[PDB]
Structure formats: C-alpha cells, structure tokens
Design an enzyme around this catalytic site. Structure first.
Site, mmCIF file in Angstrom:
data_model
loop_
_atom_site.group_PDB
_atom_site.id
_atom_site.type_symbol
_atom_site.label_atom_id
_atom_site.label_comp_id
_atom_site.label_asym_id
_atom_site.label_seq_id
_atom_site.Cartn_x
_atom_site.Cartn_y
_atom_site.Cartn_z
ATOM 1 N N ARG A 191 0.838 -1.184 0.000
ATOM 2 C CA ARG A 191 0.000 0.000 0.000
ATOM 3 C C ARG A 191 0.882 1.247 0.000
ATOM 4 N NH1 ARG A 191 -1.137 -1.022 5.822
ATOM 5 N NH2 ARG A 191 -2.950 -2.240 5.163
ATOM 6 N N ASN A 238 -5.167 1.126 8.640
ATOM 7 C CA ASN A 238 -4.761 1.157 10.037
ATOM 8 C C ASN A 238 -4.334 -0.248 10.395
ATOM 9 O OD1 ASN A 238 -4.626 1.304 12.798
ATOM 10 N ND2 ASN A 238 -6.073 2.916 12.832
ATOM 11 N N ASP A 239 -3.042 -0.481 10.474
ATOM 12 C CA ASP A 239 -2.556 -1.824 10.690
ATOM 13 C C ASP A 239 -2.890 -2.341 12.071
ATOM 14 O OD1 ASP A 239 -1.450 -2.443 8.207
ATOM 15 O OD2 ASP A 239 0.422 -1.408 8.786
ATOM 16 N N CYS A 240 -3.361 -1.437 12.909
ATOM 17 C CA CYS A 240 -3.645 -1.776 14.293
ATOM 18 C C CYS A 240 -5.133 -2.038 14.509
ATOM 19 C CB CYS A 240 -3.187 -0.648 15.207
ATOM 20 S SG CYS A 240 -1.369 -0.563 15.351
ATOM 21 N N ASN A 259 -7.339 -4.624 14.130
ATOM 22 C CA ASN A 259 -7.367 -6.058 13.818
ATOM 23 C C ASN A 259 -8.597 -6.691 14.474
ATOM 24 O OD1 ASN A 259 -4.245 -5.423 15.056
ATOM 25 N ND2 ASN A 259 -4.489 -5.595 12.843
#
Lengths: 822, 822
Positions: free
Chosen positions: B367, B489-491, B493
């Site tokens: 990305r 937002n990789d956080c 989850n």
C-alpha cells in the site's frame, strides 16, 4: 599472569582488579529466574525465557564492553563513583569481586567509603537481591546519597532492539515512594494489554526520591559513566512515558567514623492471574499484592542473610556425590567445585545466554541435551530422567531426531528440522548413562510418543531401537553411516555446496543424493550400539542384542578398513565418495573426532600401550604429533587456506579458529579418554591439564576468559591468537571433561552391576581418595598410584582383596572402603 | 526554540549547535549505495541491502545516542578533540552542521584549528567520500596528527549483532600503507568464502600509520570518546584477527598560521567477478584493481570538487518540475525543496533504515509502494512505471495482494502473506496517478503476471479489474468491504482476538469467519472505484465502466446509511456486527480515516461550505471539534484506556501514542484535502501548517525531531508528551503532504486531458505563482487569491478567459501562462 585467585574454603573465585582481559561472569539462579552478572555488575536477568521475559536491558558489543548493569552511584560531597568501577571508572583504593556458587560480591572503596554488594537469586524466588553494606572507613563524618540504577528491557528482547517504531511509545511504569517496606518502582510495559506480569525494583528504606526515565537520569549526550542526576546530587523524580524506563532510588546515608549501613534492594518478577490483574475498577493500577509480599520477605538484613544461607546450603548439599582429595589442589578444586557447578549451569541455562550467546535464540542441540546429562546425572537424576523422556518424546517414528530441542516448550524446532545423522544415537548415550548411574531400568518402560503425537506412545526402549535401526538403514557404499547435513561437527556439511552469502550451511542442501559417510558416526555406532545391545540383552531380548552386536562388529571392520588411512582414521567420504581426512591431501590430513571416539569405542586397541602396531596407538600417536599443542589439540591439520565448497562451513573460518584448526575443548576429552583406554595415563592427564581452567589460571592473560570455567574454543596453532579462548561457560566441554576426570582419569564410574574402579592418571597424582555416593551407598576409594603406562588397579574391598575392577553395589546406607594399588 | 535555520539559497538546513533535542540526520546516495549521516557524523552505510551488505556498524539505543560514526580525532599537542563534537565532547569555539541534498558538511573549531568535512555519495559510485579541510586559524604554528575512524560491520547486520559464537573469529583485513594514491585498508571478512565483495577505507596521502583492531585503537575499558591511540599520539599499526575490525589512518599535518590542508577519504564498496577475486595463485590476497581505480577517481581535491558539483547538478535538475513563489517563505521551501527531497528519499530507501527503522527488516507495504508513488511520480516517471509493473506482478490471480513488497527481490513476502483488504485498491491508485501525470496509457497493455508465475501474464488493466472485483466480492452484511486482517490502520485487527504476548496482531487470527467491515475501504472503493471506471471507459469498455460506477453508487449509499453515525462516519463493524466509531460508546467515538477519505471521495458533499447540513460538513466539523489539536488531528477520540481484545493492536498503546490517539501525519492530509473539496481553504491550510516542518521549526524543542522533514507520528492530546514526534523521514506522510499542498492547496493537478488549476488555500497566501512542467510543456500559473470560503478559480489562459478549471495540455515545448482569480 593472574587477575585473582581461587578461595577454596569459600568456594569462590576472587578477582582482585577490575582490569581483567575480558568481562568475567557468574550465573545466579537455580530454578526459573536467572541472572548473568559480571565482575563489574554487568549483565541482565530474565524469567525462564531470555528472549521473551527479560527484565533488564544489556548491550552486547558495547564500547566499552559490559558498560551497563546494576549500578550504585555514590555521591560523597559531590564526588560520584561506582563500586563496580565501571561505569564511572573513578580511582578506587580497593576493589574486589568474588564469584561464588549462585552468588557474587563486588566491593569498591574510595575516599573513606567502602561499598559491598552481595548479589544473589534466592531459592524459591523469582528475584535478584542486592545486599548492600556501606562502611565509613575514614576518620571523618560522611553524608552520602546513593543512587541505584537498572535499565529495564521491554520483555521481548528481540523486539526491544529492533521495533522502535512501536516500542518507543509503550514504556510504562508506576512509582510507589511510600511502599510498605520502603520504596518501589514497577515496570509495567504491556501489562495494559496481553501481559500478566510486571517487574518491581525496590529498596527497604524510604527513598529521598526516584527516577524512571533514563534520558532524565543520565542526561542528554552522556554515557552511564557521566550520569547527570548523581552528579547533581538529587533525583529528578522522573516518570517515564515511552522511551527508556529505568529503576532508580536515591537513599540518604550518614555515617560516623567506622559506622556502616545496610540496605537491601530487590528486582522482582511478578505475575497475577488474569482476574486479579488490577487494583482498581477502572483497570489502570496494577495489583501490587504479590510484589508487596515479595518485598516483605526481604525487608530486613536478617531475612536476607537467612536467604543467603539457604542458597549456600542448597549448593553444598547438591555437590555431595563426588569428591576427591589429592596432592593436586588444582585437580581437587575442578573436580569438587567448579566443573560440577559448570555442569549444573549448563543444565539450567541450556545454550541461551552468556557473554557470547545473546539470549535471543532459545533452543539447544538434541545432541547436547544428551551430552550435558552425562555431566549432571549424578547430581540431579530425577530431572535427568525427565529430560530423557522429554527429548525422546520429540523423536520421529523413523528414528530421526529434531536437531534442535526447545527446552521451554519441550518440542523440537520445526524450522531447523532433522537430517543430522549423529543425533539419534545420542539418545542411547543419554539413556544408558542415566541407567548406569541410577539403576532405574524402569525408564525403558515409560510410554513415550513420537513427534509429540497423542496416541503414538511406545516404551522408551523402542525409541532406542529406532535410533539404532536408523543408522543400520542409513549406511553408505562402505557400510559407514551416511552423514546427512552434518554429524557432531556442525561445520562438516558435505551435502551443502553453497556459494551464496546468507544460506545456512547446516540446512542448505543444493545437491540431493550423494554417498557422503562419516567415520565419527561409525565410531559412535560401535560405542552406543554396544550400549544398546547390552540394554536389550538385560531386557531379555537376546536375539535383538546379538543382531545389534552383529552390526556393531561389521561397523568396527568398516572403520579399520575403508575407514582407516594407514596411520589414522579417515574423517569421511564426501558427496562423490572421495575421502576426507587422508594424508594424500595437502590440507585437512587428520581430524581429531574419529581418532578419539573410535578408540573410546575400543576400535583398533591392541595388547597394551607398547603394542605400537595397534591402529589405536598409531592414531593416537598421530594426534599427538600433528594436532597437539601447548593449549590442547586442534580439530584438524593442516587447516584449510581456501574455501572448500564441497565441505560447507568448516573452511570458512580463518586458519586456527573454531572448526578450521581451533581447539575444541569439547572433543579433547574423547582423546583423553582414549588414552586412558589404551593405557597411557600420563599422556591423558597432560592433555586434560592443557585445557582445564585451574591449570590455565596462571596464563589468564593468554586465555583471556574466565579462569574458573571451560570455554568452547581455544585458538589453534595456526592462529596469531593461539591460546585465546572464546565462548565461555555454555558448552558440552563441561560435561565431557567431568566425565573424563571423574570416570576415566580418577577411574570411578558406575556400571549396571557395580562401580568400576580403574584409575589411569599417570605419575603426577601418586595418591588420592575419591568419595562417591552411588545407589544410596558411600564408597571411600583410596588409591596408591605409580602412574606406569599399562598398569591397572588391583582392588581390596573392605579389607579383602578381590579380582577385577568392579565393586558390586552395596545396600543403601552402607559405607564401602576400596583400596586401589597400581 | 530553534537549533538552526534554513538556508534557502544553499538548499541546506543549518544546525548551529551540537546540542539538538535528538540526532538529526540526512541521507546520502541517489542509487544503490546509501548512508545515514547525523549532525554529529553518526550513522552507517550500505550497498542496496541494509541487512545483508552493511559496511559499517551502528548501535541503536546507545548511551549516549549516536555515539558511533565517521570520526576524525585531532591531536594538537596532546589535546584530542573531534569536530563532530561527539564522541569526545571537547569544548568547541565553533560548531556548525549543514544538511543538503545528498550531502552534508560538519565543521568544528578548537584552539586555533578548524576542521570542515564534506560528506557525500557521488553519482556513479558505491562510496562515501569525505573532503576534509583543516585550517590553522591561530597566530601560531600547528603540528597535528589526525586519526580517521570507522567501525566495520560484518556485512549481515543481523548476524553481526547476534552470532558472536561464530563471528568474533571471522574478521579479516588487508593493510596497504603504500597504496597508489596514499594509504588503504581493506575489510574482507568472508571474502575467503562466499563473498565476492569487500570494503575499502582510504586517504589520498601517505599515512604515518594505521589501525584495524578496535580494541587496540580505543583501548580496554574505554569509550570512543576516550580512545587510547589518539591520546597516545601515534597509531598502533594493529592488524585485526577476529574481534572488531576498523579502518583508521593517522596523517601528520603541519600548518603555518593561516595555512590549510585538504584531505580526501573514501569508504568504498567493491565487487569482483568470481574468476577475478584473487591477486595471487594461492588465493590469499584480494584483487585490488577495482579498489585502486575508485581511489584514483578521488585522489585529488579537484576531482572530488567536480564530483560534488555533479551531485548538486543532479538534484537541481531533478527538482525542476514543480515550484512555487509566494509571500510565504515557509510554504515555498517546503514545496520547492524539502518535501520533494523527502519523497525521493522515501523512494530510494523504502522503509529500510532511519534512526527508528533499524535496517534489519527489508520490505515495505504494497500500500506504501503505491502511496509513495503519488509523491515522486512527477520527478521520476520512468522509475514509477517500472515500480507499478513490479508490484503488480506479485499480485494474486484472485486480486488479493501480498501485504508486504520486497523491493530488492521484487517479490511479495511469503511469511506475512495477504488478507489486508485495502491493499488491492491501492494498485488502482498508483496506476491512475501515473497515467494522469504522464499520459502513458500504454502501461495498461503491459503483460503482467500474477504471483510472478511464468505464463500467467495478462494486461495490467486486467490486474486493476481483479483489484476492483476483489472488493465487490468481499463485502459484508451492510454492503461495506470486509476488512480482513486490517485496513490502512494496521492496528485495527478485528479478526485477531489475542491474549498471548508475542502473537503478531496483524497476522494472528484466532477466530475465523465473522462479518467485520471497514468504512475506510468503503471510501477507498468509491474513490479508486471511480478511477478504475474512468480508465475502463477510456479504454473502450463501456459496459465495464458503467457496471463499475453502479457498484460505486451502491457503496456511496452504504456509507451514508449503514456507515453513518449521525454526525460522522462510523469506522467499522466488528467481527460480530457491532459498530466501531460511534457516539454510543464512551471511547473511540470518532476516527479520522473515514472522515477524510470519504469526503475526498465526494461522499456527503453538499452545495457549498455553508451547506452545514451536508454529511461531509458535519463530519469535518466533528473532526475539528473532537480530533484537532495545535499539533494536528489525532487518530481517534477518546483514546482507549483498557485493552479491547476484539480490536487488536490499537488499544495496546498508551493513550496519545501511535494508533491510540496519536497524530498520524499521514492521514491528516486526507482531511486537509477534504476541506479543500468542500470549500474551506483557510481551514485546509491551517491544518497543513500544524504538521508541516517549516512551520514547526520554531518549536523544535517540542517536536524534537528533524525540522526539515515530516515524521510519522506526533504525540496526541491525551499524551503527556503531546507535541513530540517519533519516526522521522520514512513515511508516506511525505507523499501525501506533497500531493496535498501541490495539487489541492495550491490547486495544480494533472488529469487525463489537461492540467486542473483549482487553488483552495485561504487568505494567508494572497498571491502566488506556480511553475509546473507537465507533458513536456511549462505552465506558469499566477494566482490572485481572496481566500474566501467557496470561491473557486476563474482562469485566463494565454490572455484569453476560459470556462472551467481545466487547461488542455499544450504540446511539448510550449509555455502556457494561466492567470487565476479567486
């Protein structure tokens, strides 16, 4: 030159200067919590997993080395110094450090102020305790401020040192200046989330102040040696928010001339059950009940002194199974204290953390789990039994083994896998050693799964069968065992062919097939093949045993023909069936491993030491001529001066280092034992002294590393640094040397039906007494020894001469006196 | 306060003191050889791969920070100092560091001796060059010895810092005191085996002496600040054997008053073909031909000066595509120089190495490959084309993408895998931005495989179709896109459910299935869904485009209904269909990402800025009230004060940091662009200034990091460290802010058919001129700007008024003048 001395009465090594040639460490902890502690208070602590549960931070390859640790900055009138010398390096009037069993003391004195710190991990506790005694040795009044200091790690040490993008924002603490017994800091990073644990750092008195942010305590642009806060003379009361948490308390100490003060500091690991994590409804404040309970157990000097006493009791009682008294105090201190301590530390620490192993990797070799046992089984036989069952439970059904065992999860390492063809026979080695020591044949009936698969359980004995048969069914064109990825020498990779930096030499195989064979595994199969056959026979499997002895005989013949070069044993045949370890080549003519191991296995042994046409004597004489140096025997000679693509990692080392011409202290014992077997005790003992810590103490400037424990590797004769060691402490060298001295030089070794008494140590130890507790009885063994090659002991048991060298085991509770003459 | 100032004529940031709040770095290198260089000469260099070909060693989290670099110890009559201040920290009479484009100078003066060092990596070379000028500024004669110093790394930086058991025995060097142009040291560790490369460290004059063993140069117990050899006054001529290799030469320098001396030092990376590795038949001596040639190219100051000039010409010509001239010095320097420099550096460096990224990890987000391109495509369109093809070739045939791209190998990371459901649409983003800039529709016809599988090639356009269709076929119960492991937002989850320390939040999924949806992906689908439709339609696929516009329409409706909370857009629905980002909760009521991206997509936009009922205005007004602070807009509010096991990593951060309430400078641009879309230019420019380096220079003591580049994260309002940044340099923040200011605030942006000129920047920039080179022509755009909300530009093109905001592309060679009134 020496940098200290042994204190045998105290069972301590006494380091009398800070200026050693290398940081010299001790290990604290005997259960689940461990510390590494240098003579300069350097190192770190962890609970079980040094990768994932490290309490405090330590930098390897720091400039200068070992410059972070548990420090106490003394401010005396504006002058700041540390008793550890490092990190401040102020001139001390006195320095001494004493490494003991599971504890050490470091003492520094400067301008009328002496500080003694006793460091230890108490039995029954997950904590490192510091008992600190400050003494005013001047004729003036002193008013001091002491600043304690430990730098926290963020539990996962690998993350701590790599993932800053996340981890510089997660550091959290709580400060408790009015703790029930003093003052406490709690490091609680990630307690917010998935962690059920925290650390406490506390002192048993009311602190004047505190600091928890490293950059504030130390100051911008400063090293630990120039920390701002101690220089200013008062704590900054910093509360960390991210960055680098630490624990520091300032304590005020006023002393009249001759007066002292005692303080007790605790670094504790605490876990709360998940439903008890929080003190408060809003789940913001850690539940400190367990930490207060720990701090209550070390609130006084008196409690602490009792704790220290219990630790000494632990070690004293533990080391009470083998001891020797002789003319040679170096021998005695090694046998009685230091070698046995080192073997216990290898059990406790595996291959995790030293000043050369960094605590990130967590496994150890299947082969080393078994070999380590050889050294510690006489001390901790119950734990030994368990370890055998645990590693055997990982074994594959076809008999192959995981090369790497992870002791914390009791599983094999899936990424590394299998294919190191020496690994399976080491399980026979471990099991037989266990059964000789204890007499517990019942271990062979224990149900043990393969690859930890529920339902697959079979008797442990059947695992030994599968190890044995693995080798039978994996032999090459000469009947020698196929080597696979490697054998005991991790760097002999005959199926690798790597030309790409980065590929593992141990797991990369860029060609498949081939016919590479190892004479080391061959010797191993003769040795442990016979051990297996004996167990099978005693088990009542006569047919299985005779068939095994059949295969063993065949392998002996193979070693003495296709495995024999003329004056020594070959080392292997390579992927294409070409020999390695032959005089026909310019480099790598002779390798040590097959010579020692084959002769230990009795292969080529003649009528005695003077039967010089015997292949065992020729091989050992060649070892003596070509490999022996004043610092031990090098692995091969000559070392390779160019890269041998067909042999893997071995030739990647510069000549004289590690597997390319280095002295591997682990394999020297194989030749020492082999010399006892053929009857040359004097040569055997000589070789032992060359590599043994107490005997090298007088050349500490050359050895460089600790003079009280074995190291893996001493630089070989082809290195400019010949005689300098690397990789101290965590090495199979400890077990193999203890076996060597206790069982083969001194000659006292357990067998299935009795205790063998067969000293072979040469003229330098003319009389000695061994005290050995075995199967519940005490054997007192007095030896008068001429040291003559080929002379073996004649025994008198309880005043009556007997034939042979075997003392049948007495009933538990008995004392048996054995007098030996040779 | 500030610690320096911008020098716009020189295109440098001038740091006027060593005592900055944090080490401030620059990047050298425009191709495959790169250096990190701090204002104290700290850092390291590497060729291509910072993990596997690192030349020099650098310690992260050292005490003090950044002690380790390229140093020059000056011994003047026994006083030793370094012009970089660190590591010796002697008092200097003058210090100054200037960071420029691909070079920096550091100058230090003490007791009548000034030393100026220019550091750069020349175009065409795999080397770091130091031009040192020493000047006697006293009225007295000076006799100096200058000792250079660099610490080598053993190539693989991971192994270097972990595998000591091996690697303390492999360090090798060659010393060449009589080199053709002076004196050279060769670091050649593992050249004996699989490495075809070595490093050279040399000076263009005869050195008096040398050292290659760190322990000898620095001395036992010493830090770099106390190195023994420089204090002694002469080199020890040490030749390393293992341990820690260094490169150091001593040069004697005698100067009359006012006299100067120039010296040129080179740190070079050299590779030989395998058949050419050795100088000698015995294969012990490295073939130095290529090294001598390099050194011959920097044997004189004149050659060095010419190379320095060619580097400046490189950057000066590269940055010739977009510039602005206005009343606002800060705006201009950001747009013209610093923001564009930072975008190029992100292309060159990916996410490899900074003072927060440790160079061990080697990939970057798929990305982020696409997003970075948005910022650099105007400068390096051919490299952009290649990048798009290279990342598209890794895409799976179902449209899903590898989350992580490895730019060095041009492959996707197999360990991480796929499942981050925003990833596929970013390919459309990258491709359309590329075509609008260049007009190269031919890229859509390039044969591109799936998962790099030979034979699988289809046109790039078909990859965009699979990205588009992936979202259509992976929507949840409300028609919104399923989020998968995470979105931007990789956080976040929502399929993780971890209670175990160490499990990766991004990859661990402890429950399967569920219905978790993202409104961010929804907005992303509307934006890039419409871009795909436009490409399909221009490609002649009318049906495909209309059907695509249909799905887009439905997604817009979903966002405004199920995705709308009343005064702002929800953020997600979790695994069980419960909303995230709603006012019904106490915490995490409003999240920034969807507010900005949806309104960028035109979702909820009314008839103008005063249409306060429009969802877009309500959302942005909520952003202003609840997320905006003086340092930027925080990611969500309120931050989570307890762990939300159903949401992964987000709530593990203490409130105010990173994804839990931190300011992500990367996502602020989305709201800034959204504010221009709705007509509130002043608000847009306000927000841009809050987070932009030139405007934050005056609070450098608060921001802490470099004041000439963006950082990823500034601590939010719920953090005690509100204002303080982390993760400088390597971040998509650069690209997105460049797009924001160049294309939306200043209003000049490429479309398929012309250049749109649509400034929306408010009253603070009343007049300005943009020079834009596009499709071979030069547009000179003069703007007179009232700054009134909702006023959009009226264009006059080459003196003639035109309708609308689009200027048809002129043919290459043309100069077009555009006058804009708003």
């Amino acid at each position: 030159m020496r940098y200290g001395h042994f204190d045998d009465e105290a069972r301590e090594y006494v380091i009398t200067t800070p200026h050693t040639p290398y940081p010299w460490i001790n290990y604290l902890g005997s259960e689940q919590f461990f510390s590494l502690l240098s003579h300069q208070a350097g190192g770190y602590s962890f609970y079980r997993d040094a990768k994932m549960r490290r309490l405090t931070r330590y930098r390897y390859n720091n400039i200068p080395a070992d410059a972070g640790g548990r420090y106490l900055y003394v401010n005396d009138g504006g002058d700041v110094w540390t008793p550890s010398w490092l990190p401040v390096k102020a001139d001390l009037d006195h320095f001494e450090a004493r490494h003991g069993l599971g504890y050490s003391t470091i003492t520094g004195e400067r301008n009328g102020v002496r500080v003694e710190t006793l460091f230890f991990v108490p039995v029954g506790e997950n904590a490192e305790v510091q008992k600190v005694t400050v003494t005013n040795t001047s004729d003036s009044y002193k008013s001091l401020t002491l600043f304690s200091f430990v730098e926290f790690c963020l539990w996962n040490a690998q993350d701590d040192q790599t993932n800053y993008q996340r981890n510089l924002s997660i550091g959290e603490v709580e400060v408790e200046q009015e703790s029930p017994h003093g003052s406490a800091i709690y490091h609680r990073t990630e307690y917010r989330e998935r962690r059920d644990h925290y650390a406490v750092f506390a002192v048993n008195t009311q602190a004047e102040g505190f600091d928890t942010d490293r950059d504030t305590f130390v100051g911008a642009y400063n090293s630990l040696g120039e920390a701002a806060v101690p220089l200013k003379g008062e704590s900054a009361n910093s509360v960390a928010s991210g960055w680098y948490p630490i624990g520091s308390h300032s304590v005020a100490v006023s002393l009249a001339p001759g007066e002292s003060r005692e303080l007790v500091y605790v670094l504790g690991y605490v876990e709360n059950p998940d439903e008890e994590k929080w003190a408060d409804d809003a789940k913001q404040v850690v539940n400190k009940e367990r930490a207060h309970a720990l701090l209550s157990r070390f609130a006084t000097s008196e409690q602490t002194d009792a704790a220290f006493a219990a630790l000494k009791d632990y070690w004293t009682d533990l080391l009470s199974t083998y001891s020797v008294s002789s003319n040679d105090e170096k021998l005695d201190r090694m046998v009685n204290i230091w070698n046995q301590y080192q073997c216990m530390v290898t059990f406790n620490m595996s291959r995790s953390a030293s000043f050369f192993e960094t605590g990130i990797g967590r496994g150890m070799g299947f082969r080393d789990s078994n070999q380590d046992l050889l050294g510690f089984v006489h001390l901790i036989p119950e734990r030994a039994r368990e370890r055998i069952i645990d590693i055997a439970s990982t074994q594959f059904a076809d008999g192959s083994a995981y090369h790497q065992y992870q002791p914390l999860t009791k599983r094999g390492n899936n990424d590394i896998g299998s294919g190191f063809n020496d690994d399976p026979l080491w399980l026979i080695a471990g099991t037989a050693a266990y059964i000789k020591e204890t007499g517990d044949f019942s271990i062979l009936d224990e149900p043990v799964p393969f690859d930890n698969e529920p339902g697959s359980e079979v008797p442990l004995f059947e695992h030994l069968t599968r190890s044995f048969e693995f080798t039978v069914t994996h032999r090459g064109p000469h009947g020698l065992p196929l080597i696979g990825r490697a054998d005991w020498n991790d760097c002999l990779n005959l199926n690798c062919f790597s030309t790409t930096p980065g590929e593992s030499f141990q797991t990369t195989e860029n060609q498949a097939g081939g016919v590479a064979e190892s004479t080391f595994i061959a010797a191993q199969f003769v040795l442990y093949g016979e051990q297996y056959a004996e167990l099978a026979a005693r088990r009542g499997l006569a047919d299985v045993a005779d068939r095994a002895r059949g295969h063993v005989a065949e392998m002996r013949d193979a070693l003495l023909t296709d495995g024999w070069d003329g004056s020594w044993f070959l080392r292997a045949y390579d992927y294409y069936g070409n020999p390695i370890g032959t005089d026909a080549h310019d480099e790598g003519k002779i390798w040590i491993e097959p010579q020692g191991f084959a002769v230990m296995a009795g292969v080529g042994v003649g009528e005695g030491p003077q039967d010089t046409d015997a292949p065992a004597i020729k091989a050992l004489d060649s070892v003596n001529e070509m490999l022996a140096t004043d610092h031990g025997m090098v692995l091969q000679y000559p070392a390779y001066t160019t890269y041998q693509v067909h042999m893997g990692e071995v030739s990647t080392y510069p000549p004289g280092y590690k597997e390319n011409g280095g002295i591997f202290c682990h394999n020297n014992p194989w030749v020492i034992i082999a010399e006892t077997v053929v009857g040359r005790g004097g040569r055997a003992f000589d070789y032992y002294k060359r590599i043994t810590p107490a005997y090298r103490e007088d050349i500490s400037d050359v050895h460089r590393l600790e003079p009280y424990v074995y190291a893996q590797m001493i630089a070989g004769k082809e290195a400019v640094r010949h005689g300098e060691a690397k990789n101290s402490w965590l090495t199979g060298t400890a077990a193999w040397n203890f076996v060597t001295v206790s069982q083969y030089l001194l000659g006292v070794r357990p067998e299935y039906d009795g205790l063998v008494v067969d000293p072979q140590i040469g003229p330098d130890v003319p009389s000695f007494t061994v005290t050995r507790v075995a199967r519940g009885a005490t054997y007192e063994i007095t030896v008068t020894n001429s040291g003559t090659d080929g002379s073996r002991g004649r025994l008198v048991v309880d005043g009556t001469p007997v034939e042979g060298n075997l003392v049948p085991y007495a009933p538990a509770g008995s004392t048996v006196r054995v007098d030996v003459t040779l």
